[PDB]
Amino acid sequence: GLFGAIAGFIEGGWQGMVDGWYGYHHSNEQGSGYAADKESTQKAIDGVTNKVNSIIDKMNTQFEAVGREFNNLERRIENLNKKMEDGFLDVWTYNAELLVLMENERTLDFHDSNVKNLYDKVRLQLRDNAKELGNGCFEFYHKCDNECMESVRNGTYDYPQY
Amino acid sequence: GLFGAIAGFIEGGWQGMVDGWYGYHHSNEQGSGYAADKESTQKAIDGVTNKVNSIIDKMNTQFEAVGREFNNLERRIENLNKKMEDGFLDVWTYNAELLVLMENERTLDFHDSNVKNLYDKVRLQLRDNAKELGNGCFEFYHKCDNECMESVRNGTYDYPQY
Amino acid sequence: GLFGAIAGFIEGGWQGMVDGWYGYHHSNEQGSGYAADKESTQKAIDGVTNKVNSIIDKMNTQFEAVGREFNNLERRIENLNKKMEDGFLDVWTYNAELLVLMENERTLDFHDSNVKNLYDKVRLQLRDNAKELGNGCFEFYHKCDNECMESVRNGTYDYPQY
Amino acid sequence: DQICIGYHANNSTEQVDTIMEKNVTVTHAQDILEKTHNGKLCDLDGVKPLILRDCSVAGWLLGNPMCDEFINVPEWSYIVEKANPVNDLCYPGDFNDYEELKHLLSRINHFEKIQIIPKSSWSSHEASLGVSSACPYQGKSSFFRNVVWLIKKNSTYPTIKRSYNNTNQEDLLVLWGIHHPKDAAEQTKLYQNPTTYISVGTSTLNQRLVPRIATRSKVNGQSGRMEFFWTILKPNDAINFESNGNFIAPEYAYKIVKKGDSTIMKSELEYGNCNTKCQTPMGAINSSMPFHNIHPLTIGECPKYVKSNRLVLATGLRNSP
Amino acid sequence: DQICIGYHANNSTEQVDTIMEKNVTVTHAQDILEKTHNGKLCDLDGVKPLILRDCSVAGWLLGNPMCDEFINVPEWSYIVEKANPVNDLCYPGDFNDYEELKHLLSRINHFEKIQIIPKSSWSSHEASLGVSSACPYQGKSSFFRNVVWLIKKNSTYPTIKRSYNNTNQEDLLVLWGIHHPKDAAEQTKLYQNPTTYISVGTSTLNQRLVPRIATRSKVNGQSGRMEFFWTILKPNDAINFESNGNFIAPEYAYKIVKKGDSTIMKSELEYGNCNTKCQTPMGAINSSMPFHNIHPLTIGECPKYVKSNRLVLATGLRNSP
Amino acid sequence: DQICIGYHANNSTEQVDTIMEKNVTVTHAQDILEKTHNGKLCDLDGVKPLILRDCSVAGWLLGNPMCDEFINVPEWSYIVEKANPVNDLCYPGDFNDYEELKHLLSRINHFEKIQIIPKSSWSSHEASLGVSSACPYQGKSSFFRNVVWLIKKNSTYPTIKRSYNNTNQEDLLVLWGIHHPKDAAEQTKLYQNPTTYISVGTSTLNQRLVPRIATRSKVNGQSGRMEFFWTILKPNDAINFESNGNFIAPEYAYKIVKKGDSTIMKSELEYGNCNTKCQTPMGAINSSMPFHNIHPLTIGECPKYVKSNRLVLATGLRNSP
Ligand SMILES: *[C@@H]1O[C@H](CO)[C@@H](O[C@H]2O[C@H](CO)[C@@H](O[C@H]3O[C@H](CO[C@H]4O[C@H](CO)[C@@H](O)[C@H](O)[C@@H]4O)[C@@H](O)[C@H](O[C@@H]4O[C@H](CO)[C@@H](O)[C@H](O)[C@@H]4O)[C@@H]3O)[C@H](O)[C@H]2NC(C)=O)[C@H](O)[C@H]1NC(C)=O
Ligand SMILES: *[C@@H]1O[C@H](CO)[C@@H](O[C@H]2O[C@H](CO)[C@@H](O[C@H]3O[C@H](CO[C@H]4O[C@H](CO)[C@@H](O)[C@H](O)[C@@H]4O)[C@@H](O)[C@H](O[C@@H]4O[C@H](CO)[C@@H](O)[C@H](O)[C@@H]4O)[C@@H]3O)[C@H](O)[C@H]2NC(C)=O)[C@H](O)[C@H]1NC(C)=O
Ligand SMILES: *[C@@H]1O[C@H](CO)[C@@H](O[C@H]2O[C@H](CO)[C@@H](O[C@H]3O[C@H](CO[C@H]4O[C@H](CO)[C@@H](O)[C@H](O)[C@@H]4O)[C@@H](O)[C@H](O[C@@H]4O[C@H](CO)[C@@H](O)[C@H](O)[C@@H]4O)[C@@H]3O)[C@H](O)[C@H]2NC(C)=O)[C@H](O)[C@H]1NC(C)=O
Ligand SMILES: CC(=O)N[C@@H]1[C@@H](O)[C@H](O[C@@H]2O[C@H](CO)[C@H](O)[C@H](O[C@]3(C(=O)O)C[C@H](O)[C@@H](NC(C)=O)[C@H]([C@H](O)[C@H](O)CO)O3)[C@H]2O)[C@@H](CO)O[C@H]1O
Ligand SMILES: CC(=O)N[C@@H]1[C@@H](O)[C@H](O[C@@H]2O[C@H](CO)[C@H](O)[C@H](O[C@]3(C(=O)O)C[C@H](O)[C@@H](NC(C)=O)[C@H]([C@H](O)[C@H](O)CO)O3)[C@H]2O)[C@@H](CO)O[C@H]1O
Ligand SMILES: CC(=O)N[C@@H]1[C@@H](O)[C@H](O[C@@H]2O[C@H](CO)[C@H](O)[C@H](O[C@]3(C(=O)O)C[C@H](O)[C@@H](NC(C)=O)[C@H]([C@H](O)[C@H](O)CO)O3)[C@H]2O)[C@@H](CO)O[C@H]1O
Ligand SMILES: *[C@H]1O[C@H](CO)[C@@H](O[C@@H]2O[C@H](CO)[C@@H](O[C@@H]3O[C@H](CO)[C@@H](O)[C@H](O)[C@@H]3O)[C@H](O)[C@H]2NC(C)=O)[C@H](O)[C@H]1NC(C)=O
Ligand SMILES: *[C@H]1O[C@H](CO)[C@@H](O[C@@H]2O[C@H](CO)[C@@H](O[C@@H]3O[C@H](CO)[C@@H](O)[C@H](O)[C@@H]3O)[C@H](O)[C@H]2NC(C)=O)[C@H](O)[C@H]1NC(C)=O
Ligand SMILES: *[C@H]1O[C@H](CO)[C@@H](O[C@@H]2O[C@H](CO)[C@@H](O[C@@H]3O[C@H](CO)[C@@H](O)[C@H](O)[C@@H]3O)[C@H](O)[C@H]2NC(C)=O)[C@H](O)[C@H]1NC(C)=O
Ligand SMILES: *[C@@H]1O[C@H](CO)[C@@H](O[C@@H]2O[C@H](CO)[C@@H](O)[C@H](O)[C@H]2NC(C)=O)[C@H](O)[C@H]1NC(C)=O
Ligand SMILES: *[C@@H]1O[C@H](CO)[C@@H](O[C@@H]2O[C@H](CO)[C@@H](O)[C@H](O)[C@H]2NC(C)=O)[C@H](O)[C@H]1NC(C)=O
Ligand SMILES: *[C@@H]1O[C@H](CO)[C@@H](O)[C@H](O)[C@H]1NC(C)=O
Ligand SMILES: *[C@@H]1O[C@H](CO)[C@@H](O)[C@H](O)[C@H]1NC(C)=O
Ligand SMILES: *[C@@H]1O[C@H](CO)[C@@H](O)[C@H](O)[C@H]1NC(C)=O
Ligand SMILES: *[C@@H]1O[C@H](CO)[C@@H](O)[C@H](O)[C@H]1NC(C)=O
Ligand SMILES: *[C@@H]1O[C@H](CO)[C@@H](O)[C@H](O)[C@H]1NC(C)=O
Ligand SMILES: *[C@@H]1O[C@H](CO)[C@@H](O)[C@H](O)[C@H]1NC(C)=O
């Protein structure tokens, strides 16, 4: 992806994280586990939901075909009628398929961006109190218990404290 | 935004920066103030201006309706005429509204990208001679007077000097 | 570009790198030279090739004009025929020119993103065993011979070893 | 001790296409194209369609004797006609401005048949021998039930001067016809007068028909032809007929009681004993999808037709192997 | 000491829409849709339109006596006709190929009326009693001023053989008509000869009209009808009339002096004493916007019509609360 | 010691446009618009087109004596007609439903001319004096070769009753005509009978033509006119003619042996001695590009026409100065 996180420096997703799209995995002497980042997950839900409705809504007004019959010496206008109905169908088919391809690319990239921003957000808190391992993980210099871990997810990791 | 800067790690904009879209705020013993980054600001003006003209220009050639009258036993072709005029209006309405939505998203993201690149540009100069605070700001280890500050905006911050 | 690498913090391209789109330049006591990153280069080839075929393919089904002749007292339907043929041409001309502009922007940005991700990939390996110079280059603290250089391109640069 | 940033994965095999890559597996996706129908013709919103079966619109309206099923049809939602109905014009000929009339029917949901010129009010002409073997009924020769094929009585066809005044509140569809005979002998044999005409007038109409004689190929055993005409008689207007022979007189005409949304749907399917909100010529649709690919000609509250085989939007993210 | 990177904010409340988010407040934006008009019909680029008022195009061209305002109209930019003008055909009937003629007018900016067959050159026929109460003027019976309704003189209608040669450099619009009487008595009463015709020939035209008699409903107090025909007579060609009765002869015909961009605009509005560069049926437009949503049918140098209520492009960036 | 990350550059001057920036130099690009043609009319896929040269479709089909080149034409891929062919109707008149016939030809690749009513089987009428100076051939007066202009023999024109039965397997295009004389004297001079007709019947057709007399301007030295009609006679159907005078009888009619993809292409160009897979009115196309901008009306396997002057996709990346 464009933002380098999903299937990039973070090699793969987590089957174990059930409660959100993006989040954290912690590991210390007390144990280990997953926790979803609620804010960024809900941001993603809102953006994608609005998008789907925007797509549906834009394709609301669209060409509707109507039956018109012509006799044996009205072949020219019959053909004109046929070319007109077909022409509009092709235009709207094109619009629909292109919109889906284009927006699918942007949706995948959007998720990649949200993972990247979450990662940077944590990176900017920890600063030089942790080793950036290069795979999505940060290895602490100090011991980081569950309250410590929670403050990283909070946004309130007290860097001067460590 | 996709690039994480605007309303991301930089929480909010500056009412105090009047002379440009992006720039710097400095703070030392001599005082404090704002200064616009001219180059990246002008880059943004050119890109957005070209875009607006590109949008207007592409919608230059477009369907124009013409009055055609039909009698009481030409209902089929009257209806064909009506469906054709309407059909094209709907197609062009769709094109116009979609182009605006899509390009508005890209314009906001473009600005976000320009802030991110300006931030990184400064980060790559300062390197480890300053603390990355995580909010858009860099706190210096040495004392940085107005000439010092100016060299950061220059691109000529002499890292070996400090 | 949106991702800041191409014509950004990496000022210019390399005439000397002939065998790929993106890669590395090394410089030590043994000598210097270029080497293409095969994986990311081939990724770019596949994405751009699929794109071109996707573009061509979407424009496959499209309005075809047909000759229809009318007499001197069929001016209204002649005009309708003319406006219909022209209308569809303008719609498809618009679609074609807009698709090219939009996707050209994304192609240039795609390349920029691939350079940025390659750069970060190297940055995350080296960590604090090298000075980030700010121009695309990393200056090593230890001496880095050709095997050393090769492990950076590998992905197997043993940070604990240095 | 460490903390890691990461993203969701699951057992999804759903795939989406993008510009640069096809068949990308994603954690979640949303199909937006309806691909299925029930394969049946159904009531629209409770209101049953008019299924003409083997009859055409002409056979119905003129009252082809093989179309007695539709002698008095209740209001319809839409109309269903086969591509090549066998019961069209039983006696060969033409229906003038037929296509423009069928178009008129797309804005009509209900007719009320009424009598304007009683069959048993033609005292100066024979009005019960106007039949042919080309229009059979129960083994006997019959004719289009809604119009009267008048002939001479005791070797005279005196001039007809008949007028009907539309005292109804509703627009009225009036049908009539002219008969084209095989040759000069048939003309006098039926109508006596050798040179004839039919003149029809309203406030808008100014018609005068004359029979064209010509040697014609047999069609359903007849060399003669019937050419049928129509008009819409507005309220308080009167239609005026004058004729010398060859006149196919109106017996019944249709009141247009309800105008609204309708359509003539071409289909070989029969009634499905069934209900839907959206109907197509090959079956009904029941979905909340914004798109479908069943058929372009639909009626009701429908998704938009597209020619695609597949429209699937990514909602979730790229799924891991 | 510190240096910070940041971005502009201001007091803007302007909002734009994107695919993922609606009503995003931005620092700067640019509206590209013109939503206003002045509500008036105006001169286009100085050149005043032809405002037919209560007259139709037929009433104008034939010279309906209630349309003397337009007896000689200067060149126009566009034409304005009401949806249902009251002064159309005062004497009831038809205007043949009327719609094709109105289409012809979309490529015409100026007519010059000239006389081709003088009213006082009909020495063998009465040419000053061709009037009716359906076409009144100042309390008296009158008629379409541009054509002459000829009748018999001293109980004879001798054959007419009249020819006009287009010696003008400019194409010529020629109008004429045929009268349909109520019955056989009216025919002889006006024209003597019981069976009549009108034959018209040019290099392209080969016409022969015959009057259709029929009992017709009264329209403006008349059972009779007038059917009007036209042709474009090319330079150096001649039009040839021969008639037996029922002929409505050309008196005046229109030279086509200027061809160019025009349109027949349907509107109930009157003249606005006003000037514009872009006109619509509900008012004029004066803006530099690339789009508008006033009305699809415009004339002049206009923005492109779209059905949108709102088109606003983001120029600046997301604004902070 | 250092390692650097970087990207390709080269000597490319290729440029592409984007929304925000025009004329961006890139390392690689791909043109997708074909801009060139060979300027010639060519065989389509080996199969040569019918190039009517100075003849029109009417002149060809009726057999205008100046169009003997096309007296028997092999099967074609497409047809090429000039904008204003000089050899159209040599004797002035009309070709009825001409445009609908030309449309029919877009679905036809080959005719086979056959004789249905032999010229030397008109024993009761003169069938070898039906000529005019308006249709010359080698200095002498001639006529449309495919139809017979019959006149009276020894001062009598007895009624014609002729029938042709289509025993061929293939649909048949039948042409005939009616002659309009200058005046009453010419009528009797050619046909004796003063009031005449032509009646034509098939299973579908019910026609009766009457000659319209009128004083007409001379066109190619003739005041008289010829009006030409046609029908498609289906297999096992018969066409029936009855006439009193003024009949232009069929001599030859065209079998429709091959139906398929064709087109009438309007062009002033002549044959190019040349082969292509995709043809336009201004030249042939030979490229693998998905688009072209030569001309909208093409035939064959072609790229899609667009109005663009330039379509170039970026493949590589931004190139460095
Ligand atoms: C088909 O048959 C229709 C009737 O069966 C016939 O309708 C018309 O018939 C006559 C035509 O002369 C009209 O008779 C009189 O009605 C007028 C009433 O005006 C209005 O007000 C009353 C109020 O109660 C309404 O009922 C009525 O609907 C109408 O809206 C009346 O004014 C007029 O008489 C006048 O008297 C004046 C002096 O008192 C005179 O100045 C004036 O000249 C006039 O003589 C009129 O004669 C019917 O009203 C009318 N029926 C209607 C409208 O329903 C159709 O004409 C017939 N069609 C054809 C083609 O023949
Ligand atoms: C409507 O009325 C029109 C005139 O009022 C009439 O126009 C035509 O009238 C006659 C038709 O016979 C023509 O008379 C002669 O003009 C020819 C001149 O040729 C050209 O050169 C001169 C140069 O000064 C131009 O003025 C002129 O416009 C033209 O372009 C002349 O050549 C020809 O005579 C010939 O003589 C030859 C021997 O010398 C012969 O071989 C040959 O056969 C011929 O006799 C011709 O007779 C008018 O010129 C012409 N008027 C024009 C073109 O303006 C229309 O015909 C009439 N319409 C109808 C339907 O009747
Ligand atoms: C143009 O000219 C055509 C011939 O030159 C003419 O075609 C028709 O001509 C007569 C019309 O009466 C038909 O004659 C008889 O053919 C029927 C045969 O049926 C089928 O089977 C045979 C099998 O070998 C096929 O050849 C044949 O094509 C056909 O498909 C026959 O059944 C029928 O006779 C019947 O006898 C029955 C008792 O045995 C009776 O109940 C019944 O009433 C009938 O008398 C029929 O008479 C030709 O077959 C037919 N030609 C064809 C189809 O090719 C066209 O009619 C003529 N066009 C016009 C407008 O006149
Ligand atoms: C080809 C051959 O050997 N003989 C035909 C001969 O059959 C034909 O006579 C007509 O035949 C048809 C059936 O093919 C009908 O039987 C015609 O009779 C009727 C009819 O049934 O239609 C009787 C009916 O009572 C008549 N009704 C009235 C109101 O007149 C009608 C009517 O006259 C005609 O339909 C009008 O066109 O006809 C029967 O006449 C003759 C054609 O007359 O030709 C032989 O060659
Ligand atoms: C219904 C009833 O009680 N009586 C009508 C009777 O009124 C009608 O006569 C005609 O009435 C109309 C008005 O309704 C006119 O007055 C007709 O007269 C004129 C006319 O003004 O149009 C007089 C005019 O001088 C005539 N002009 C010429 C050139 O002939 C015309 C002309 O003849 C006709 O318009 C041609 O159709 O008529 C007056 O005749 C009669 C219908 O004749 O019917 C009664 O039932
Ligand atoms: C204007 C003038 O000075 N004189 C014309 C006079 O020329 C004209 O006669 C006709 O002239 C034309 C050429 O302009 C032909 O020569 C006509 O003759 C022919 C013809 O060639 O077409 C002879 C031919 O044999 C005839 N063929 C048959 C089958 O009848 C035809 C035919 O009768 C007519 O074409 C039918 O319309 O004509 C010659 O008649 C006369 C018009 O008759 O008018 C003078 O004013
Ligand atoms: C996010 O997480 C941090 C760290 O876990 C939160 O700080 C902690 O908050 C808890 C619960 O409010 C505090 O618990 C308190 O303990 C004292 C006894 O020591 C007791 O008297 C109180 O009743 C309460 O249970 C805890 O002290 C505190 N710890 C630290 C190191 O700060 C923080 O509040 C969270 N912030 C957000 C925005 O979610
Ligand atoms: C960007 O900013 C840096 C730092 O401010 C610039 O360097 C400084 O440039 C100024 C003005 O040219 C120099 O001032 C000079 O002072 C000496 C006396 O010391 C005097 O003789 C000269 O006449 C002049 O006024 C200053 O010395 C210099 N300082 C440093 C630390 O470099 C730099 O030139 C700017 N570069 C760009 C690209 O804008
Ligand atoms: C990428 O590059 C690294 C570093 O160049 C590779 O490790 C090196 O691999 C080479 C070739 O396989 C090894 O050479 C060996 O040398 C020994 C003698 O010392 C000899 O017995 C073997 O036959 C062989 O020639 C070399 O030892 C090794 N060096 C280091 C420091 O690891 C690595 O294999 C590459 N990995 C990938 C994924 O490409
Ligand atoms: C993406 O996956 C689709 C879905 O399976 C593939 O479509 C199949 O393609 C094969 C080979 O052309 C056909 O025989 C099958 O009929 C297709 N199956 C279905 C369900 O459509 C497609 O090949 C894949 N596309 C790409 C570009 O790899
Ligand atoms: C975005 O803002 C617009 C503009 O105010 C909102 O439009 C209003 O919507 C309400 C509720 O539907 C209507 O009653 C008003 O008439 C609308 N006002 C105007 C000026 O259009 C809209 O609701 C907002 N959209 C979203 C998605 O939040
Ligand atoms: C995939 O996982 C879901 C849990 O969301 C489970 O319900 C389903 O049974 C699983 N499907 C398969 C095929 O294992
Ligand atoms: C349509 O199908 C859905 C099943 O998804 C069902 O809930 C609904 O009742 C159906 N409606 C009708 C009219 O059959
Ligand atoms: C917003 O700020 C601008 C300065 O650009 C000022 O002119 C304007 O008065 C302000 N508007 C309001 C409502 O305060
Ligand atoms: C159009 O309105 C603008 C106001 O923005 C004004 O400058 C211009 O003069 C106006 N033109 C006309 C013709 O009214
Ligand atoms: C540009 O470089 C290419 C090498 O790919 C070479 O073939 C070509 O000659 C060069 N063109 C010019 C104009 O120097
Ligand atoms: C078309 O031109 C190409 C040159 O690119 C050539 O290879 C091919 O043979 C040509 N085909 C024809 C039919 O001229």
Author numbering:
A (entry chain B), B (entry chain B), C (entry chain B): 1 to 162
D (entry chain A), E (entry chain A), F (entry chain A): 1 to 321
Paper lines:
However, it has been established for the H1 (1918), H2 (1957) and H3 (1968) pandemic viruses that a change in the binding specificity of the virus membrane glycoprotein, Haemagglutinin (HA), of avian viruses from a preference for α-2,3-linked sialo-saccharides (avian receptor) to a preference for α-2,6-linked sialo-saccharides (human receptor) is a prerequisite for efficient transmission of avian viruses to humans. However, surveillance of human H5 viruses has revealed a number of H5 mutants that show enhanced human receptor binding with HAs that contain other amino acid substitutions in the receptor binding sub-domain. We have carried out structural studies on the HAs of a number of H5 mutants that were isolated from infected humans in Vietnam and Egypt to explain differences in their receptor binding properties. None of the substituted residues in the mutants we have characterised make direct interactions with the receptors; they appear to have their effects by perturbing the biochemical properties of the receptor binding pocket.
BLI experiments with mutant clade 1 VN1194 viruses indicated that Ser227Asn and Asn186Lys mutations, located in close proximity to the receptor binding site, reduce avian receptor binding (red curves) by ~1200- and ~80-fold respectively, compared to the wild-type VN1194. The VN1194 mutants – Ser227Asn/Gln196Arg and Asn186Lys also exhibit significant decreases in avian receptor binding in BLI analyses. Their avian receptor complex structures show that both mutants bind avian receptor in a fashion similar to that observed for avian receptors bound to the HAs of pandemic viruses and of the H5 aerosol transmissible-mutant. The α-2,3-glycosidic bond between Sia-1 and Gal-2 of the avian receptors bound to the Ser227Asn/Gln196Arg and Asn186Lys mutants of VN1194 adopts an unusual cis linkage that is usually found in avian receptors bound to HAs derived from pandemic viruses. The Sia-1-Gal-2 glycosidic linkages in the two mutant-bound avian receptors are in cis rather than the trans conformation that is typical for avian receptor bound to wild-type H5 HAs. Due to this difference in linkage conformation, Gal-2 in the avian receptors bound by the Ser227Asn/Gln196Arg and Asn186Lys mutants, is rotated ~110° about the 2,3 linked glycosidic bond relative to Gal-2 in the wild-type H5 avian receptor complexes, making Gal-2 in the mutant bound avian receptor appear face-on (in relation to the view in Fig. 3). In both the Ser227Asn/Gln196Arg and Asn186Lys mutants, the stabilising hydrogen bond between Asn-186 and Gln-226 is lost, either due to loss of the asparagine side-chain as a result of the Asn186Lys substitution, or to an altered Asn-186 side-chain rotamer influenced by the nearby Ser227Asn substitution.
